[PDB]
Design a protein around this ligand. Sequence first.
Ligand code: HEM
Length: 214
Amino acid sequence: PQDLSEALKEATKEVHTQAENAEFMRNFQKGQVTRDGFKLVMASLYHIYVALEEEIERNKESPVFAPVYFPEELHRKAALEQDLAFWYGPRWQEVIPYTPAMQRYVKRLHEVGRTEPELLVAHAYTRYLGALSGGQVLKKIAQKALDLPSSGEGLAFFTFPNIASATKFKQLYRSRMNSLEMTPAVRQRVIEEAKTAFLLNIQLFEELQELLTH
Ligand code: HEM
């Protein structure tokens, strides 16, 4: 398509479906999620966003990313830190798992941020725009499945407090993405990186499912 935001959505429909079809996510959507399983997903989200925001902060002034730099509206690290303290306790930093599949995702994020920063937008799009769209549906399913007490914590990740209107912000974020200047060769790679992001999530889901079935 013409607009990058339009091209991204179009090219990732197939892999997005695969994500939804992943056994781990199938169970999740069927409301068949356990606390042990939800803890693992929160853990991986932490590693993922720490690496991602670390790289974004590194290329924020670069012309290949600056346009989609919205730190206050999107940053998720503090949110996950709060959440993990609830899920794994005060010593969460010493006990949260950091699995091989999580590491493979983290390693690709640092690789892009450091050797192909022009592709970072692919990951910011996939994480942030994704979380902002299908984030509510998964949170709804989660709480309704988890049966959390009433301690007022554990799900801050699913709320973007600095964004008043999700639809208005996504319009803006798409605009900014469509303003990025890139050669057709780069655009094709940004498109490919996005699909790869999905694949990294799928192999993560496959790993988490394996760890939980024993
Ligand atoms: C398997 C559970 C998932 C469900 C049920 C889910 C659901 C949704 C829904 C309902 C939307 C709403 C906006 C729309 O469709 O127009 C959406 C958009 C999106 N999702 Fe997912 N999603 C899931 C997993 C993921 C994963 C693993 C990623 C990637 C890390 C992701 C990335 C995206 C992106 C980037 C968009 C926005 C695309 C665009 O606007 O161009 N989703 N998702």
